[PDB]
Design a protein around this ligand. Structure first.
Ligand SMILES: [Mg+2]
Ligand SMILES: [Mg+2]
Ligand SMILES: [Mg+2]
Ligand SMILES: [Mg+2]
Ligand SMILES: [Mg+2]
Ligand SMILES: [Mg+2]
Ligand SMILES: [Mg+2]
Ligand SMILES: [Mg+2]
Ligand SMILES: [Mg+2]
Ligand SMILES: [Mg+2]
Ligand SMILES: [Mg+2]
Ligand SMILES: [Mg+2]
Ligand SMILES: [Mg+2]
Ligand SMILES: [Mg+2]
Ligand SMILES: [Mg+2]
Ligand SMILES: [Mg+2]
Ligand SMILES: [Mg+2]
Ligand SMILES: [Mg+2]
Ligand SMILES: [Mg+2]
Ligand SMILES: [Mg+2]
Ligand SMILES: [Mg+2]
Ligand SMILES: [Mg+2]
Ligand SMILES: [Mg+2]
Ligand SMILES: [Mg+2]
Ligand SMILES: [Mg+2]
Ligand SMILES: [Mg+2]
Ligand SMILES: [Mg+2]
Ligand SMILES: [Mg+2]
Ligand SMILES: [Mg+2]
Ligand SMILES: [Mg+2]
Ligand SMILES: [Mg+2]
Ligand SMILES: [Mg+2]
Ligand SMILES: [Mg+2]
Ligand SMILES: [Mg+2]
Ligand SMILES: [Mg+2]
Ligand SMILES: [Mg+2]
Ligand SMILES: [Mg+2]
Ligand SMILES: [Mg+2]
Ligand SMILES: [Mg+2]
Ligand SMILES: [Mg+2]
Ligand SMILES: [Mg+2]
Ligand SMILES: [Mg+2]
Ligand SMILES: [Mg+2]
Ligand SMILES: [Mg+2]
Ligand SMILES: [Mg+2]
Ligand SMILES: [Mg+2]
Ligand SMILES: [Mg+2]
Ligand SMILES: [Mg+2]
Ligand SMILES: [Mg+2]
Ligand SMILES: [Mg+2]
Ligand SMILES: [Mg+2]
Ligand SMILES: [Mg+2]
Ligand SMILES: [Mg+2]
Ligand SMILES: [Mg+2]
Ligand SMILES: [Mg+2]
Ligand SMILES: [Mg+2]
Ligand SMILES: [Mg+2]
Ligand SMILES: [Mg+2]
Ligand SMILES: [Mg+2]
Ligand SMILES: [Mg+2]
Ligand SMILES: [Mg+2]
Ligand SMILES: [Mg+2]
Ligand SMILES: [Mg+2]
Ligand SMILES: [Mg+2]
Ligand SMILES: [Mg+2]
Ligand SMILES: [Mg+2]
Ligand SMILES: [Mg+2]
Ligand SMILES: [Mg+2]
Ligand SMILES: [Mg+2]
Lengths: 57, 50, 143, 177
RNA sequence: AGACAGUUUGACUGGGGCGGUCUCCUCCUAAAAAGUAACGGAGGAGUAUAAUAAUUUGGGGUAUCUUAUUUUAAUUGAGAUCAAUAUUAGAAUGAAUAUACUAAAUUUGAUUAGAGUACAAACAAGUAUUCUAAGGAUAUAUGUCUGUCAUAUUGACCCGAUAUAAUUUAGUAGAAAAUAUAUCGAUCAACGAAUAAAAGGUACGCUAGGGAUAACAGGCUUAUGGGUUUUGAGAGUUCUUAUUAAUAAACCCGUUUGGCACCUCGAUGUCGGCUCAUCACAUCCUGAUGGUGGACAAUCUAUCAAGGGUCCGGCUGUUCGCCGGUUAAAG
RNA sequence: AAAUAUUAAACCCCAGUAAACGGCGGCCGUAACCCUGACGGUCCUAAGGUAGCAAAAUUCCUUGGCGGGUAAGUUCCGUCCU
RNA sequence: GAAACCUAUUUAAGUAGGGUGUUAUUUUUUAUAAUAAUUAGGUUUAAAUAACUAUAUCUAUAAUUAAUUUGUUAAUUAUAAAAUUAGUAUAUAAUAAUUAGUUAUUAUUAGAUAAUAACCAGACUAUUAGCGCUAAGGUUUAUAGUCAAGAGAGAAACAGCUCAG
């Protein structure tokens, strides 16, 4: 398989987020960060990369 | 690019006549056993429409 | 079948339960010819039996000809698979034991250029008696 | 009667080798057959170039402003300096026309020759037509002591001198000077 | 601690079992609408990717061949040629050439919400996208963009979980907890998934059903098998047909090995031997005759012919078969 | 409410047990002839079927080969050993 | 007055929904058949040939080899343009009839909705294909018809063929 997920969180403390993929075996230096829409604010803001959980049992 | 425009050599009465000769041959290669059973009723109607 | 990779690939072709075709015969290269007169599965041994007897006609010692006598265009087309003896039906298709040529009705088996009219009529009659097929011989003379 | 042409494997590999090599580079080092340069150049002297060329690429119109007073004078200066030059430049355009006519007259007449010499002139060796070597007569040499003193600055002469050591380092025309 | 117990121990299938398969994609089959099965033929999928995506801009049109060039080509110039090739992320088909390939500048539309039609379609599921609103990119925009040329690139519901645009009543107020918007976890691959949780033997065997389903036998078929007929490689002193016969070919028979699974599954059957028989002729002897490389004899071959006849014994469970001995012959 | 520290039998590791079960090799070349292989190497194994018997109630090819008995014996006796 | 078809199923002799049947209701045709016009298609056609497998010829121009009959004689090669032929399940630029969709006309008489049952083992023949000895009353699909659920007359006698309902 060789893929991993991660969620993109807002600079604001809304907790809204999107998803994305990257391969596990790469050696990326640059974490992602993008300008996207937080409907809670009705405005674009800078999103940044973060960790995603998993399912336990 | 061998392609060159098509030609209707054969006149129309050939292709009619060619389709007819194509039957007279295949009718000769038949089995006689199939041929009389076909030709036993297939005649009678003609004598019975006439 | 598939002509791409003949030897490499394993080949299968549908038996054609009723296949009939007629192709209007006409001479192109030469004067006289032999032509088939019935749809048929033309084997190879139907040719190799009377292969020498054509060489004795078309080719002779100490005689040189520039142009060409015979034009052949025969190639194999049908694998003709089969099952073993004690095998039930189903469980796949049979395996090979031969190859053949499926020919149409009016097929130029041979095309000749200035070859003895008197021998080919003596040949094709014996040809057709071994094979029990209807075959014909044609020359530009009679036409 | 002509049919389509099939592909050569040469065009195949070039299409593929690039994609292997867009990431990598062929210029980086002795991967390419590369001799080292004239040893007058040094690791520190390239950094002297890089560190200051890094500065020049980072310049823009927004790192800089200019006073209008400096600007308005810059018109009349470079306008009239150019006006003298348009007079100069447009002469060369007129000059080169008449020069090329002279070439056209003779090329008509070169046909009007005997068989022997007409071969050579058409079939000259390119080595003779390919002479781009310098001479004692070069207007950078002939006028060097004059031109060294006519400028307003030594720097603008240093623009020339440092320029040559590069070109001398390229063609390897400098050695242990 | 099978010491003891309660239970499971898939299905399809040309009998069943062993083996193989079980979902999804593309063509042939498929018979010019769509659809169309089979343990029919073949190949593939369980991904990739933050640039391989979005808007603008530039470049040679690509490809095949020849040739010349300050020996150089971002992708040089010229000429001819190409039932659209080159390619278009991977299988196959289909299509595009404003494709595709390549260089570059700005950038995240691979954003949020709500209404609705059409195709397809048992159901559920799946598909394409216009219209309305907010908030952005591109930059003449006048306009274009709601992931990739397309089709596969996966999984229901329950339970549970992290972040949260919203609400709350087990007396009241809070905690707890439930639900809601966004979202994550399965080769549950027997892929509509019966459970979180599952293998075998029965020659000690039982019951209910079935000729819906097998072994002997009948019936259909006759590749195979046996025999007739035509042709005649090659032997026969010469010489195709005294004798012999490869190969190729046209029909017959229903005695072998088998294919199918129509009758019988609601008391029976298997080979062999004793006794008892009957029929065919494609005849082993006897009887008639032609031919002969037939001197006589003995013999070989073919035709007509079913009147009567056609062995005992040793070994073996044995038909058969080898052996001993015989006979007009031991069909 | 959660976590760390303390620890029993049992399980793992280790040891023992073969009139318990169970298991018991191959390759290369070598001697006045190929073949034969005492021997010598070669690789591996926990160890390499030792004694003895052997077409057996154990043998697929098999009515195995030779001999005995019988006018003649797929069974029987004796005997050899993939 | 049917069905033995599709789709799912620890399901295959079971069951469920669609489809077909009956009844009832309604100022009720979204219908069936026949004729004609009309649209796309890419089986078939084909002295067609783009592809694959194989293949027969022609030629400007530019050259070769041997020999003392080297101011001759003789034998030969390559090539732009031109250019043939056969075959195929998974080959077609192009291109039939019929079927199918829509519209109109005529004629029949149903359609829609609701309440609800049975069926979901099929057989043969004609045409057509796939496995099979293009063998089988064989086996699996498609388009009609008949048995099924249907007597009478003809096929010597005959569930499936003809006439007929
Ligand atoms: Mg138990
Ligand atoms: Mg237990
Ligand atoms: Mg119970
Ligand atoms: Mg079963
Ligand atoms: Mg079976
Ligand atoms: Mg169709
Ligand atoms: Mg067809
Ligand atoms: Mg079906
Ligand atoms: Mg697979
Ligand atoms: Mg692309
Ligand atoms: Mg462009
Ligand atoms: Mg060009
Ligand atoms: Mg793709
Ligand atoms: Mg492709
Ligand atoms: Mg999204
Ligand atoms: Mg519809
Ligand atoms: Mg739905
Ligand atoms: Mg999709
Ligand atoms: Mg898009
Ligand atoms: Mg559940
Ligand atoms: Mg209470
Ligand atoms: Mg309360
Ligand atoms: Mg489950
Ligand atoms: Mg299931
Ligand atoms: Mg299922
Ligand atoms: Mg489904
Ligand atoms: Mg017992
Ligand atoms: Mg019973
Ligand atoms: Mg039987
Ligand atoms: Mg028969
Ligand atoms: Mg036979
Ligand atoms: Mg002889
Ligand atoms: Mg002979
Ligand atoms: Mg039955
Ligand atoms: Mg019976
Ligand atoms: Mg019973
Ligand atoms: Mg009874
Ligand atoms: Mg007789
Ligand atoms: Mg008798
Ligand atoms: Mg008498
Ligand atoms: Mg005795
Ligand atoms: Mg006895
Ligand atoms: Mg005897
Ligand atoms: Mg022991
Ligand atoms: Mg021993
Ligand atoms: Mg013995
Ligand atoms: Mg003995
Ligand atoms: Mg003994
Ligand atoms: Mg009625
Ligand atoms: Mg039906
Ligand atoms: Mg199930
Ligand atoms: Mg049942
Ligand atoms: Mg229903
Ligand atoms: Mg209904
Ligand atoms: Mg087409
Ligand atoms: Mg043609
Ligand atoms: Mg040419
Ligand atoms: Mg043809
Ligand atoms: Mg076709
Ligand atoms: Mg059923
Ligand atoms: Mg059924
Ligand atoms: Mg059926
Ligand atoms: Mg059936
Ligand atoms: Mg049949
Ligand atoms: Mg049947
Ligand atoms: Mg059946
Ligand atoms: Mg009746
Ligand atoms: Mg009757
Ligand atoms: Mg009728």
């Amino acid at each position: 398989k060789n893929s991993i997920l991660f969620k993109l969180v807002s600079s604001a403390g809304t907790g809204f987020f999107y998803l994305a993929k990257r391969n596990a075996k790469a050696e990326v230096i640059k974490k992602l960060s993008l300008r996207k829409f937080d409907p809670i604010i009705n405005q674009y803001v800078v999103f940044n990369e973060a960790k995603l959980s998993s399912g336990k049992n | 690019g061998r392609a060159k425009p098509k030609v209707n050599h054969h006149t129309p009465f050939e292709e009619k006549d060619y389709s007819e000769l194509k039957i007279y041959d295949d009718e000769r290669l038949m089995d006689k056993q199939y041929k009389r059973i076909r030709d036993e009723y297939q005649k009678a109607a003609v004598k019975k429409e006439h | 079948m598939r002509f791409k990779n003949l030897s490499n690939t394993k080949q299968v072709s549908f038996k054609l339960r009723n296949f009939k075709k007629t192709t209007k015969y006409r001479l192109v290269f030469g004067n006289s010819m032999i032509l088939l007169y019935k749809n048929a599965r033309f084997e190879s041994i139907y040719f190799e039996l009377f292969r020498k007897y054509i060489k004795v006609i078309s080719k002779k010692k100490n005689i040189n000809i520039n142009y060409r006598n015979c034009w052949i265009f025969l190639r194999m087309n049908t694998p003709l698979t089969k099952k073993s003896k004690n095998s039930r039906m189903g469980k796949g298709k049979g395996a090979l034991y031969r190859w053949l040529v499926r020919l149409p009705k009016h097929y130029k088996l041979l095309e000749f250029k200035n070859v003895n009219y008197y021998r080919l009529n003596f040949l094709t009659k014996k040809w057709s008696k071994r094979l029990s097929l209807p075959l014909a011989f044609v020359s530009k003379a009679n036409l | 009667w002509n049919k389509k042409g099939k592909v050569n494997e040469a065009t195949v590999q070039a299409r593929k080798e690039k994609k292997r090599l867009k990431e990598t580079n062929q210029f980086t080092g002795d991967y390419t057959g590369e001799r080292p340069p004239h040893p007058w150049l040094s690791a520190k002297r390239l950094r002297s170039i890089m560190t200051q060329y890094q500065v020049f690429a980072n310049k823009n119109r927004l790192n800089i402003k200019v006073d209008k007073k400096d600007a308005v004078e810059m018109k009349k200066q470079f306008e009239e300096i150019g006006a003298h030059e348009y007079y100069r430049m447009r002469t060369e355009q007129i000059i080169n026309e008449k020069n090329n006519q002279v070439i056209d007259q003779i090329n008509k007449e070169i046909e009007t020759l005997p068989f022997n010499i007409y071969e050579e002139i058409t079939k000259m060796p390119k080595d003779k037509i390919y002479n781009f070597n310098t001479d004692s007569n070069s207007p950078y040499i002939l006028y060097f002591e004059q031109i060294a003193r006519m400028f307003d600055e030594e720097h603008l002469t240093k623009l020339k001198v440092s320029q040559r050591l590069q070109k001398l380092a390229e063609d390897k025309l400098g050695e242990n000077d």
